[PDB]
């Protein structure tokens, strides 16, 4: 209680070490009395501040401590629950040596107290952006993968901005980026995202590289046929083919693109397991 004053004092005084623990000791006291709500607020708040003061250590510690309480008080995953953690994620230094740790800590909690096997979507969007701040592209790609619509937007931009950065682009180069969107979203069975991500990416590819093409439409579906990117064509046809779940179409598409069936061996194999039983 009255001690609270004396420590925040040490904070706004230049004694980070002092304040961090003093708070923790007082915090552990709240938990001891099972006054969880009080603890959650104390710890969480104190962390954010340490992060704002650029005190990576102390801050990261409290963040975990909060999670520890979260799992102790069995805090269910909801808006207010995710909010606190999200708020903290924004103050985390993308260079924090234990970034991935923090990310995992909360995501784990999001899973244990939710019906999502991979964590809460909303929380993912925030986490994804953070990982990218640390140039952890691959790690980010996955979180956005299982995120919200915004995650999709950042995901397509993540790949696109990467494709452009390429100095020695190639016919197969474009496929390396595009295929990811199609496959990844086809793995989590998110046809809506697969189509929208594919739409934004293909349009940007066309308005920048100006590849000679002609749109082929039929029954409502459209395939942006590229005269110099056979890979892109195959990948687009694969998307629609998975929607039909028809074994014949799957076999026909692969028999025509023998090399692409070998270049996307593993992927096509799983697709036959998910959309063809």
């Amino acid at each position: 209680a009255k001690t609270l004053q004396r420590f925040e004092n040490k904070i706004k005084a230049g004694d980070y070490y002092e304040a961090h623990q003093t708070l923790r000791t007082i915090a552990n006291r709240y938990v001891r009395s099972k006054s969880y709500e009080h603890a959650i607020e104390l710890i969480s708040q104190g962390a954010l501040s340490f992060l704002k003061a650029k005190q990576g250590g102390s801050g990261t510690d409290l963040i975990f401590y909060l999670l520890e309480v979260y799992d102790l008080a069995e805090v269910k995953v909801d808006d207010i629950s995710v909010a606190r953690l999200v708020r903290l994620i924004a103050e985390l230094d993308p260079s924090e040596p234990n970034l991935k740790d923090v990310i995992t800590g909360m995501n784990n909690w999001s899973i244990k107290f939710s019906e999502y096997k991979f964590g809460d979507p909303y929380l993912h969007n925030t986490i994804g952006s953070k990982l990218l701040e640390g140039d952890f592209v691959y790690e980010a790609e996955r979180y956005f993968m299982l995120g919200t619509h915004d995650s999709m937007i950042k995901y397509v931009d993540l790949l696109w901005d990467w494709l452009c950065q390429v100095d020695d682009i190639e016919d197969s180069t474009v496929a390396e980026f595009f295929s990811r969107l199609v496959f990844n979203y086809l793995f989590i069975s998110n046809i809506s995202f697969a189509h929208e991500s594919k739409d934004i990416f293909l349009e940007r590819f066309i308005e920048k590289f100006h590849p000679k093409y002609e749109k082929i439409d039929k029954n409502g579906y459209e395939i942006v046929f590229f005269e110099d990117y056979s890979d892109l064509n195959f990948l687009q046809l694969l998307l629609i083919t998975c929607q039909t779940a028809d074994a014949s179409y799957f076999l026909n598409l692969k028999n025509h693109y023998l090399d692409f069936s070998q270049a996307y061996k593993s992927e096509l194999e799983f697709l036959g397991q998910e959309y063809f039983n």
Partner: protein, 52 residues
Amino acid sequence: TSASGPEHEFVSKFLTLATLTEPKLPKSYTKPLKDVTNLGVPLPTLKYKYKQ
């Protein structure tokens, strides 16, 4: 041009065939993330470095 005609006739025909009857999975379909069990097969690593 007619250099990519063979593949064009394939893509165009395959599409027509794959959409005569409404596909089993509509474009506005999205398996709730509460049901996704796995993340499919790991894709290859891009030979490009990232930054921003």
